[PDB]
Amino acid sequence: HMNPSTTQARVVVDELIRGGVRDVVLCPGSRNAPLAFALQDADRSGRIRLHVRIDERTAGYLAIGLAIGAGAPVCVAMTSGTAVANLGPAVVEANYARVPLIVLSANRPYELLGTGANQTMEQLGYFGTQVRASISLGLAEDAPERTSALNATWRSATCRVLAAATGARTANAGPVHFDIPLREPLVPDPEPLGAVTPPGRPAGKPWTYTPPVTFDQPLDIDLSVDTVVISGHGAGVHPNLAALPTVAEPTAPRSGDNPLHPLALPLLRPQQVIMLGRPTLHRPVSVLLADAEVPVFALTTGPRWPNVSGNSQATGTRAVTTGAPRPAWLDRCAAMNRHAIAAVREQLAAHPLTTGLHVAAAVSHALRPGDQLVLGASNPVRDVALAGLDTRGIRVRSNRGVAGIDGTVSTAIGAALAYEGAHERTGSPDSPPRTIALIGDLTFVHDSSGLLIGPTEPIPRSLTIVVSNDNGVSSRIFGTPHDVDVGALCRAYHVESRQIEVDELGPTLDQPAGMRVLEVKADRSSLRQLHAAIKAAL
Amino acid sequence: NPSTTQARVVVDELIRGGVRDVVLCPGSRNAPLAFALQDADRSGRIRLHVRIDERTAGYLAIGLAIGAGAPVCVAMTSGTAVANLGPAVVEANYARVPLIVLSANRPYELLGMEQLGYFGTQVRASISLGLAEDAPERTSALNATWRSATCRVLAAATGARTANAGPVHFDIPLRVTPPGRPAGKPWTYTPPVTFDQPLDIDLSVDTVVISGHGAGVHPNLAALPTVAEPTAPRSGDNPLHPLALPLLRPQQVIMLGRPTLHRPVSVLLADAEVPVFALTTGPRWPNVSGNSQATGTRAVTTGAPRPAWLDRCAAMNRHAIAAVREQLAAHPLTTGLHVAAAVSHALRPGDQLVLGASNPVRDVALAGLDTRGIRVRSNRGVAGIDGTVSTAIGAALAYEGAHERTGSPDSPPRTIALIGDLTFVHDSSGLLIGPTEPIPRSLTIVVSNDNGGGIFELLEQGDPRFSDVSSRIFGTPHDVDVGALCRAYHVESRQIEVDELGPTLDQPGAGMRVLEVKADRSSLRQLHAAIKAAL
Amino acid sequence: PSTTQARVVVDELIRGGVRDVVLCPGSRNAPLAFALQDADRSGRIRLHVRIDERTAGYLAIGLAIGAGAPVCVAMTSGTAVANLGPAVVEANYARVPLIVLSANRPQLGYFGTQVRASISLGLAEDAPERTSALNATWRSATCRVLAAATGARTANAGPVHFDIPLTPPGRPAGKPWTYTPPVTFDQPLDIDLSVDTVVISGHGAGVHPNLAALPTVAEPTAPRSGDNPLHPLALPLLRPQQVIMLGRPTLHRPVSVLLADAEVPVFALTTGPRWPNVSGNSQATGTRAVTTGAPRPAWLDRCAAMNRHAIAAVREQLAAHPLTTGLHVAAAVSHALRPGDQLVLGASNPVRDVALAGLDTRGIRVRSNRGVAGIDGTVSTAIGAALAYEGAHERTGSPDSPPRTIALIGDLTFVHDSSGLLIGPTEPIPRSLTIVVSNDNGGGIFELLEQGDPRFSDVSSRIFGTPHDVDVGALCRAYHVESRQIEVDELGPTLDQPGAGMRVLEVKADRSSLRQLHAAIKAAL
Amino acid sequence: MNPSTTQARVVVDELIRGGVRDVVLCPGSRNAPLAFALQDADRSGRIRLHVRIDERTAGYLAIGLAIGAGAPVCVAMTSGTAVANLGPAVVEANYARVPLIVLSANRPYELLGTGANQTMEQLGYFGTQVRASISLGLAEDAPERTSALNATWRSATCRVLAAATGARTANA
Ligand SMILES: Cc1ncc(C[n+]2csc(CCOP(=O)(O)OP(=O)(O)O)c2C)c(N)n1
Ligand SMILES: Cc1ncc(C[n+]2csc(CCOP(=O)(O)OP(=O)(O)O)c2C)c(N)n1
Ligand SMILES: O=C(O)c1cc(O)c2ccccc2c1O
Ligand SMILES: O=C(O)c1cc(O)c2ccccc2c1O
Ligand SMILES: [Cl-]
Ligand SMILES: [Cl-]
Ligand SMILES: [Cl-]
Ligand SMILES: [Mg+2]
Ligand SMILES: [Mg+2]
Secondary structure, three states: OOOHHHHHHHHHHHHHHHOOOOEEEEOOOOOOHHHHHHHHHHHHOOOOEEEEOOOHHHHHHHHHHHHHOOOOOEEEEEOOOHHHHOOHHHHHHHHHHOOOEEEEEEEOOHHHOOOOOOOOOOOOOOOHHHOOEEEEOOOOOOOHHHHHHHHHHHHHHHHHHHHHHHOOOOOOOOOEEEEEEOOOOOOOOOHHHOOOOOOOOOOOOOOOEOOOOEEEOEEEEEOOOOEEEEEOEOOOOOHHHOOOOEEEOOOOOOOOOOEOOHHHHHHOOOOEEEEEOEOOOOHHHHHHHHOOOOOEEEEOOOOOOOOOOOOEEEEEOEEEEEOOOOHHHHHHHHHHHHHHHHHHHHHHHHOOOOOHHHHHHHHHHOOOOOOEEEEOOOHHHHHHHHHOOOOOOOEEEOOOOOOOOOOHHHHHHHHHHHHHHHHHHOOOOOOOOOEEEEEEHHHHHHOHHHHOOOOOOOOOOEEEEEEEEOOOOHHHHHOOOOOOOHHHHHHHOOOEEEEEOHHHHHHHHOOOOEEEEEEEEOOOOOHHHHHHHHHHOO | OHHHHHHHHHHHHHHHOOOOEEEEOOOOOOOOOHHHHHHHHHOOOOEEEEOOOHHHHHHHHHHHHHHHOOOEEEEOOOOOHHHHHHHHHHHHHHHOOOEEEEEOOOOOOOEOOOOOOHHHHHOOEEEEOOOOOOOOOOHHHHHHHHHHHHHHHHHHHHOOOOOOOOOEEEEOOOOOOOOOOHHHOOOOOOOOOOOOOEEEEEOOOOEEEEEOEOOOOOHHHOOOOEEEOOOOOOOOOOEOOHHHHHHOOOOEEEEEOEOOOOHHHHHHHOOOOOOEEEEOOOOOOOOOOOOEEEEEOEEEEEOOOOHHHHHHHHHHHHHHHHHHHHHHHOOOOOOHHHHHHHHHHHOOOOOEEEEOOOHHHHHHHHOOOOOOOOEEEOOOOOOOOOOHHHHHHHHHHHHHHHHHOOOOOOOOOOEEEEEEHHHHHHOHHHHOOOOOOOOOOOEEEEEEEOOOOHHHHHOHHHOHHHOOOHHHHHHOOOOOOHHHHHHHOOOEEEEEOHHHHHHHHHOOOOOEEEEEEEOOOOOHHHHHHHHHHOO | OHHHHHHHHHHHHHHOOOOEEEEOOOOOOHHHHHHHHHHHHHOOOEEEEOOOHHHHHHHHHHHHHOOOOOEEEEOOOOOHHHHOHHHHHHHHHHOOOEEEEEOOOOOOOHHHHHOOEEEEOOOOOOOOOOHHHHHHHHHHHHHHHHHHHHOOOOOOOOOEEEEOOOOOOOOHHHOOOOEOOOOEEEOEEEEEOOOOEEEEEOEOOOOOHHHOOOOEEEOOOOOOOOOOEOOHHHHHHOOOOEEEEEOEOOOOHHHHHHHHOOOOOEEEEOOOOOOOOOOOOEEEEEOEEEEEOOOOHHHHHHHHHHHHHHHHHHHHHHHHOOOOEHHHHHHHHHHOOOOOOEEEEOOOHHHHHHHHOOOOOOOOEEEEOOOOOOOOOHHHHHHHHHHHHHHHHHHHOOOOOOOOEEEEEOHHHHHHOHHHHOOOOOOOOOOOEEEEEEEOOOOHHHHHOHHHOHHHOOOHHHHHHOOOOOOHHHHHHHOOOEEEEOOOOOHHHHHHOOOOOEEEEEEEOEOOOHHHHHHHHHHOO | OOHHHHHHHHHHHHHHHOOOOEEEEOOOOOOHHHHHHHHHHHHOOOOEEEEOOOHHHHHHHHHHHHHHHOOOEEEEEOOOHHHHOOHHHHHHHHHHOOOEEEEEOOOOHHHOOOOOOOOOOOOOOOHHHOOOOOOOOOOOOOHHHHHHHHHHHHHHHHHHHHHHHOOOOOOO
16 A cells, blocks of 8 residues: 555656656655655656756756757656745746746645645646646545546646647647645655555556647748748748748758848848748847838747737748749848858957957857757847857757746756757767857856756766856946856856866867866957947948 | 826835835836936935845845835836746745835737736735826826825735735836925825734633744733744743643643744644634634634733643753753754754844744754844745845845934844755855945854755654665755855855854954854754653 | 727728627727727628627627627626626637627736637827837737637637727738638547447537448537437447547536446547546547548447437337426427528537437537536527528528527526527517427426435425426517417427517426436336 | 535534525535535524525625625535626625625536536636635545544635635725
C-alpha cells in the first residue's frame, strides 16, 4: 500500500514523462514534497533531468530556456503561496512567445482556503487569461478499491495539461497552470511495506494519444506585385516565398537567400507586404505596417494573428502564389540591401570608441553553423539585426514575448542545457554544440542570480555569456552608473569570467570550459552619433 | 494640460492622507503622476524610491508601510509590473498592509497592462478616476471629484471603514494646483472606525493565550500564560515558552490574531475538547481545524486564573527555558538557533527587528525573545522567503523617518534583520540602491548561513531514511560567496562567529551592513531532539 | 464621433454575415441602436426587439442555429449581463456564434470563462485628419470579433463580448475588411475496423463516410453518417470491443455505462479542439479516421438482430400501454415529419423519447440545446430557429410555402419560457412554427431516476414531481397565440394542416405510469 | 451511510441553527441530497420549504423572503444554467445588501473540462457580486474522520452565514 499523495505524484510524473517532458525545474518546499520525491526518483533512473533552483521567478525563465532550446514541454514545480505568484513573469512571457510551460503547483486542500491556514492563497485562477488552461487535480482519496479509476482520471487530466501546453489540438502552445492539492502524509511510507505505481498504457504510450495536428488556411497572393516579406517571432518556413526580399528578425527562421536590411525598407516603396509571424523589433517595419495604402497579408503558424497592422487584407497559414516578382524589383531590393550593409560597415570602422554595435558585429562574425545564439531583448537583438547576421544554420533564441529583462541569464542557461541534451540523443560522440549569449550589463546584473546553480545540479557544457557593459523621474537611476562589478557577481556565484577587448572576442570565443562570462566594455556616449552617422550614410 | 493638473491634485490629496513614501520603477509608459511625484520629491513633501526590479520594489513598499504604519504607493510602468507585483500584493492582502498600486491606462487604445487573475481576489478596491476633461468652469467640481476618489482609495487601503487594511488598485487614465480643505486636512474626513465584538470568557477555567500575527493588545488578559509569536504585540508579563505547551493540559484557549508557528500550537488548536475563542482586530478570523467556538474583538472577563494553574505553567516554562539553554551550550557546532539566541540578547529597547521566514522566526521564539519595547516585523501573511531584504530596507527607512521627524538629536534607532541564506539569496538584488535613492542609516542584516534550508531537517522529509534523496530536493546547497555578493553591490559585509555577533552589533558601521555567520544544519535535527528529551 | 463609429461597426458586421440582431430596450447603446435601426429599415439586417433579456439571448441562439450564421445581441441595461448569462453558457458549450454588444459609458465572473474573446474598441476620438485609420482599426477589430465567434481560425465557435465604449467605406464588393478562409482542422486516427466496433455520435459530430457501415447509435441532433442505425436500448445486449465516439454524447445511461467501461477502448473524433473524457478511458482523439480492416459479418449480424429486437419491443409495449404518455407523443411527432422539416427538441424526456421512438433524422434538421441541457429558453430558441430557417428559404426564392418548424417540449419548459411568446406586432413572427407541448403536469424524467423509486413515493411529490396545474390554453390566448388541445391520434393530421404562423398544440400525457412502461420495455428485450 | 446524505444533513441543520427559516428549492437530479434533507426539515417544522420551477424567479422569491423579516434565506438548485439564472437576483441582493445564500449542487470539480453533461464553471460565476465564494470538500467515504468532517462542514456553513448576514463586516 502507498499513501494517496505518493501514489498521485508518481502517476502524474509518469504521465508527464510519457508526454515528452524531458526536463523539470523544481523549487524546494514542504507542500510539494510528494512531487519532489517522485521527480527525484525519475531523475535517478534517468527518465528525466531534474534542475533545482531557489528563486522561483528565475526558475520559470530557466524552464522557458529548457523549452525553446529543443521544443519540448517543460514543467516547473513549486510549493504553495508566493512561490506560485513568482511564476507570473515567466507565464506572461510564455503566453506571448507561445512556449509550452507547465506550472505544477502544490497546494493545501481547497477546504482550507478562507480558514487562515499557513502559506495558503487563491492559487487556482491566479494567472487569469495568461494561461491556456487552469486545471486542478482532485484531492487524492484513500480508496484502494478505486485505484484503477483514479489512475485513469489522473492520467487523463495530465494529458489534457500536456495537450493544452504544446497546442496539440489548438496549434496555440502556451503556459498551463496545473494545481495539485495535497494533504498529509506528504512523504513516502516505508518502502519494504510499499507498493507499485498504477501502470499506464503499454509501450510507454500517453494515456490519451493525440496525433500531430494540421491547421491549414490557404491564401492567394499575386507575387508579380512588388512584395516585401517581413518575418518576426514565431514565423514559419515558406519555401514558395524564398525568392522574395525579406526583412527577417534574428529569431525568425529564414526561408530563402534574398535578405533585405531593415534600414533599407524606408528607402523602398513596396506595393504589398507579406507578414510572417509576429514582428515587433524594427520601428521602420512598424511604420510601413501603419501605412494604410500598402496591403498586408499575414501568415501565422497558429490561430493567433498579429495586430501590428490595421490594413491586413487577409490572414492565413500558407500562400498559394501566382506570378513571379519583377526582376527589376529584385534588383532594386538587392541593390539597397548592399547599400545599407556597406553604410553600417563603414560607419562602424570610422567610429573610434567601441560601442554595443561593435560587440554585436564581433559576436556575429564568430558564429559558426550549428551554434545557438541567445539574445537579450533590449539592444542585443536590435544590434545583431543592424549588424546583418546570417541566421541560416544557427538557432537564435530571445524572449520576444514581452521583451523583458527578467530571466535572460536563466533562459540562456536552460536553452544551452536542452540544446546540448538533444545532441546526445543523436548518439554522436562529438563535442556538444556551442551556445553563445549576448546580453547587456543592466540585464546581466538584474538576473545575475540566474547564474546560481547548486553543486549537484546540471551545468551547461558549452555556454558563453558575452556581456556588453556600457554602464547603462524614474530614469534618474540611469543618471549615474550602477557601478556593479561583473567580475564580483561571477565570483559570488562561482562562475569563471574574463574581461576582454572586442578584438579578443573572436579568438577567445573559439577556445573550447563549461560555463563562462566574457565581459566587454563599450560606450553609450557616442551611440547617438554612430546611429546618426549611419542614417546620413544611406 | 488637465492631466498634469489632475496628477498634482491626486499627489497632494495622497500626501494629505498620510502617504510619505512612493516606490517607482522605470518603464516604457510614463509613470502615473511621475512629474507630480518628482515635484513633490524636490519640495520635500514626499520621498521617492526608485528600483529596477519590480518584485523587490513591491516588497520595499511593504517594508515602508509596516515600518511605521503608513499607506505606501507603488507606481507601475511596464507590461511586467503586474506579474512582478503579484507576490507583494498577495502578501499585503494576507498581512493587511495598506498598499496602493498606481496604474495609468489608456482608454483611447484598443483592449482585447498585462493583467493576471489576482487583482480580483487580492485587493480591497479597484477605483478608476476617469479621463481628465478640459473645462475651466468645472475646475472646482473636478477638484472635488478627484480628491473624493483619492480619499476613498486611502480609506480602502487603510481600512478606515472596514477595519481590514490591504492593497488597492488605483487607475489614473491618460490620453497652479486647485486647492484642498484648509489646514492640510483631507477632503473627506473618515474617523478610523472602532470595531467592537465583546465576548464572554471565564478565566477560572485553565486558560492559555496564543497570540499570532495581527493580534491585538488586551490588558484584561495580561495575567494569563501567553504563547506569543514574535510579531505579536505583547500585553502581559506572563510569557509561556512554546515548548512548554505540550507539557500542559489547558481547558480553554484564547487565540489572538492569526497564529502560524509551532506544531504544538496547531495540535492544541485542533483538539475538539479544548474550546478556542478567537479575538481579532478585523473582520477575518482563523479556523483551520473547525474548532473555533466563538469570535470577538475583546474579552469581557469574569474570574481569575487559579494560582495553581499559574504555578504549573511557570514551572513548565522554566523547564523549557532550561532545556533550550543547556542543550545549546552542550552542542559544539553553531546552528541558526545559536545565531538567533545571540541576536536576541543583543537587542535594546527601541530596536526594530525584522525576521525572515523558515527557522529564524521560529528560532527567535525558541530562544525566548523579550519583545516589549521592541518592534518586530515579519512577512507572516503568506510566509514567503521572497523579498525579505527589501522589506527590511523599507522598514528601516520608514522607521528612521519617523524618528527623524520627532526632532530628537539622538542617532536613528537600529533595525536588525535576521534571515537565512536562501532568504538572502532569493532577494539579494534588493541590496542594489543607487546613490540618488534613500539608503538606511542603521540597517544591519544578519545572515545565518547554513548553506541550504535547515527547517527541512526538522520535518518528516528530514528523517534519516531520506538522507540519500533529501539533499538535492530539500537541502538545496548553493555555495554562494555572500561576502563577494555584497561587494558587487557595494555593501559593507563581514563574516563573524556567533560569539562576536553581540559586540559587532553593539557598535555602529555604515548605514547598511550585512553580518554573515556560518552555521551547521547537519546537527539541527539532533539538537532539537535533545532539547525535547531534556524538557 | 460615436455616431460614425457605430455605423462602420454595423456595416462590417453585415459584411461578416450577420443577418439578425436582438435588442432589448434600455437607457444605453443609443448610437448603435440607431445604426441598427437604419440598417433594419434599409433591409440589410433584421431587428428583433424583446423585453426579457434572458429570452432575447435564447432567441439569438435560435437565429444562429437555424442557418449557421453569426448573431448579435445588444445590451442596453445594468441587468443585461446577468440576464444573458444562461444563453452565453449555452453558446459556449454548444459552440454557437453569439456576439454580445456592450457600450460601457466609461460585472460577474462568467465573461472571463465563457466567451471566446473580449474586445473593446476604445473611445471615439475626434480627429478627422485620421478618419481613414480609425476606419481600418474599427473594421479590423470587428473582423476579429466575427472570427472569434464563428471559429474561423480556431474551429471553435462561441460567444464573444464586443464593447463599443461611449460613413467611410470598406473593401469594394461588400467584402469583409480582413478576409479569413474557413480553416481546415485535421488530425488522423488509425482505427482497425475488424475489431467489433460501435459508433456513438452526439452533439457537434461530423460526417464520416468511411464509418457509414458500422452500427451507429446517434443522438437526434447528430447528423447521420450512414444507414446502419443501432437502437440505444440494444447496447446493453451487445459486447463491443471498441467504441468510436463522434462529437459530445450526453444521453442514454447505457451509452454512459459503455463509455465508462475500462475494457472497451474509446476513440474520440471531434470537429473542434475540445474532446470529451468523463471516464478517463479516451484512448485517442482525432478529427477523422484512417481505417484498415472491415467489420466482422458475425458482429454486424448480431447488431442488426438486437436492433430489430429493440425496435419491436418499443413499438409493441407502446401499443399495450393504454394511457397516453410522453413517449407516445414523441412517437407521434416522429412519424408526422417529412424531408425538409426542422425539428426543435427540448431537454429532459422529449429529446430522449424521440430517440427511443426511432426517429430517422435523414432529411430533417434537428436542433436542441444540448450544450448544458437546460429547460430554459426553449420557446424563444424555437422561434429564432424558425425565423432564421424561413429566412434562408425566402432568400432562395422557391415557389413553395416556408418549410415547417416543429417544436416538441415538455410542460415545465413551456412555462419556464412562456414569455418568449410575447412578440410585439412590429416584430418578426415565424410563419410555419408549431410548438407541440407534451403535458404530464410535472417532471416525468424523475420517475425514471432513483428518486422515482416507489420507496420515495411520499417524499418525491414536492421536490421532484412539482405539479403546477397551469392552464396552458389560457396562457397562450393571453399572449395572442393560437392554441388547441388535441389527442395523440390527431397530432399527425393537425400537424399536416397548414395553420397560423405560431400554433401551440397541447397533448395531455400521463407520468404516473411512466416507470411501469419503461420497465415493460426493458423486460421485453 | 452514503456521504452525500450525511453531508447534506449537516449543512441543512447548521443553516437552521443560523436562523434560516425559509429555503427555496428548484428541481434537479444533482441537488437531490439537499432536496431530501430539506424536505425532512420541512416535515419536522424546522424550516418552510418553497419549490419553484424557474430559477430566476426563485431568486427574487428568496430576496422577498429575506427582506420580509430580515433573516438569511437560502436558494438551492442543480448544476448548469440553474446557477446562471440566479444572476439577476444576486446582482440585486448585492446592491441592496440582502442576505441571499445561493446553495448550488455541482458535479465533482474533476469533471470540469471533461465534457460531462450539465457541467459549467460554477465556482466564481458570480465574481465580484458575492460577499464570498465557499466550496465544501467533496464528501469523503471515511468513517474514521466523521467528527473532523462535521467540524469542517459546520464551520464552513457558519462562514457562509456570517458573510451573508454581515455578522462581522456590517455588509450583508
Ligand atoms: C517564495 C517561497 N519559496 C519557497 C518557500 C518554501 N520554503 C519555506 S522555508 C524554505 C527554506 C528557507 O531557507 P533559509 O532562508 O536558508 O532558512 P533556514 O530554514 O535554513 O534557516 C523554503 C524554500 C517559501 N516559503 N516561499
Ligand atoms: C434551467 C434548468 N433547471 C433545471 C434543470 C434540471 N431538470 C432536468 S429535467 C427537469 C424537468 C423538466 O420537466 P419537463 O420540461 O416537464 O419534462 P418531462 O421530463 O416531464 O418530459 C429539470 C428541472 C435543467 N435541466 N435546466
Ligand atoms: O487576524 C488577522 O490578522 C487575519 C488576517 C488574515 O489575512 C486572515 C485570513 C484568513 C482568515 C483569517 C485571517 C485573520 O484572522
Ligand atoms: O465536440 C464537441 O462539440 C464538444 C463541445 C464542447 O462544448 C465540449 C466541452 C468540453 C469537452 C468536450 C467538448 C466537445 O467535444
Ligand atoms: Cl508527512
Ligand atoms: Cl539585454
Ligand atoms: Cl515560515
Ligand atoms: Mg539556511
Ligand atoms: Mg412533464
